[PDB]
């Protein structure tokens, strides 16, 4: 009946395991927008760009 | 001697805010009998902003117009869907007979007149071209007063509302007295969003966050607004009237 591995208990998982799916979904979400983001960058220009990360 | 770089921000824990419908119930009573065309609401939104920062000087084109400087009257078939659609757009008058008899009296409550593609014939039969000529209100395609689409033109002849931040507040009208809660509601959401959109568009150094939203009339008291919309009293329900 110990924490996690006992009868009825459920393992919690490490932080990098609980956030694994949300981690890969964020990278997938970004690549899908990569083409449209490069077009805006190659169109607006390297100098007039202002949408920088934070 | 002392100085601060901020605008005084009071504590709202004890404030008494009102819902939009509950508030209009208090205001509509103080404006009993007042000309609805000369009585308009107003909103003062206090912002937690620094004195040194910049100011807002953008414009907003509300769904329904509030300024009564350009009163537009349309001529559509009586009872048609355009009649009610015209009122939902900001039309002061929409009809053939009601307008024909109104202009024949000698007093025109409006300053501009339009004619839809469906009421072209009946116009000349009313025998009124001799009336609108001198006043220059003769609806003609030369003035682009005849159109099949209405909302497409109502956005140019009327204009766009202007708002400016003077000192930690922004003051501008939001609707006339005759505005129904449904029309007045969206008329406010368009104003708050355009602001919050311009704030985020601004720099991130000092994001100006809203603190309170007030609502009053030209002769009414300044009351606080709650995000809610429906009345707290279960007996009352959304009711529209003069």
């Amino acid at each position: 009946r110990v924490k996690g591995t006992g009868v009825g208990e459920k393992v919690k998982g490490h932080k990098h395991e609980r956030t694994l799916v949300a981690k890969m979904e964020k990278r997938r979400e970004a690549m899908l927008a990569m083409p449209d983001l490069i077009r805006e960058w190659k169109k607006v220009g390297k100098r007039n760009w202002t949408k920088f990360p934070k | 001697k002392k100085q601060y770089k901020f605008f005084k921000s009071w504590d709202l824990t004890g404030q008494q805010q009102f819902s939009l419908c509950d508030a209009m119930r208090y205001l509509r009573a103080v404006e009993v009998g007042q000309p609805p065309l000369s009585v308009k609401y107003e909103v003062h939104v206090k912002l937690r902003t620094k004195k040194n920062g910049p100011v807002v000087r953008d414009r907003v084109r509300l769904p329904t117009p509030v300024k009564t400087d350009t009163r537009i009257a349309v001529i559509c078939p009586e009872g048609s869907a355009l009649q009610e659609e015209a009122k939902n757009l900001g039309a002061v008058m929409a009809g053939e007979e009601t307008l024909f008899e109104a202009i024949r009296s000698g007093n025109f409550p409006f300053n501009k007149l339009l004619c839809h593609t469906e009421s072209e014939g009946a116009l000349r039969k009313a025998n009124v071209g001799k009336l609108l000529g001198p006043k220059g209100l003769m609806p003609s395609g030369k003035t682009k007063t005849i159109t099949n689409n209405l909302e497409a033109t109502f956005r140019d002849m009327i204009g766009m509302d202007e708002y400016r931040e003077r000192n930690g507040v922004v003051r501008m009208a939001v609707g006339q007295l005759g505005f129904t809660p449904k029309q007045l509601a969206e008329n406010i959401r368009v104003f708050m969003a355009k602001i919050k959109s311009d704030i985020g568009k601004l720099d991130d150094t000092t994001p100006k966050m809203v603190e309170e939203v007030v609502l009053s009339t030209t002769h009414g008291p300044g009351m606080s607004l709650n995000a809610e919309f429906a009345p707290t009293d279960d007996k009352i329900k959304p009711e529209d009237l003069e």
């Binding site: - | 008494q16 509509r28 009993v32 009998g33 007042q34 007093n107 008291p221 003069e242």
Partner: protein, 195 residues
């Protein structure tokens, strides 16, 4: 301008829901119309106070009935009000056409529909009181009673005006005393300083 400043100035002006002229009108009524002059002359002061004192208290408890006013410049105009009491046993007629308020008499008293019977009430050189009671007894309506919290609202703001008027005169006595003292000295030094 604190939140409590604006709060006390509001809750005092919220006497609309009070005893003087508030009452729950019956569903039999349909709409109201009134017409009077701008100024107070030739018996026209009565309706004005009825419009600024008791009439607003009806729309709060009766926000569904339209109460319109039609002002005019003709001081001799008939200060009379019509009450569309009859709704044809609540038959719900289609009374779509109805005017709106104005200031030049542009919205006179329209003719009632078939299922409507108006009730005329004259008022000229008569006090609002006699005009008010004539409205309730004729238009049978139950008068709403205030709650204990409303009695505290009247009692609180009443005691407040005591402290206010006590201060209105006090601060007035310090400014004039200064405006007076600042003058006595001006007549002494600033008078000879001109040379």
């Amino acid at each position: 301008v604190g939140v409590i400043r604006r709060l006390n100035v509001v809750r005092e002006l919220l006497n609309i829901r009070a005893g003087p002229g508030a009452a729950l009108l019956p569903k039999e009524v349909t709409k109201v119309h009134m017409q009077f002059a701008h100024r107070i002359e030739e018996g026209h002061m009565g309706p004005r106070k009825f419009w600024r004192e008791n009439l607003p208290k009806l729309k709060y408890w009766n926000p569904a009935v339209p109460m319109v006013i039609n002002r005019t410049t003709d001081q001799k105009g008939p200060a009379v009000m019509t009450i569309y009491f009859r709704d044809d046993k609540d038959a719900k007629p289609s009374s779509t056409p109805f005017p709106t308020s104005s200031a030049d008499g542009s919205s006179p008293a329209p003719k009632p529909a078939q299922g409507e019977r108006i009730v005329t009430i004259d008022m000229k050189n008569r006090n609002s009181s006699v005009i008010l009671k004539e409205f309730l007894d004729k238009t049978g309506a139950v008068a709403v009673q205030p709650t204990a919290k409303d009695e505290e609202e009247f009692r609180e703001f009443e005691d407040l005006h005591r402290r206010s008027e006590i201060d209105r005169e006090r601060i007035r006595k310090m400014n004039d005393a200064k405006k007076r003292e600042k003058a006595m000295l001006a007549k002494a030094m600033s008078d000879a300083q001109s040379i």
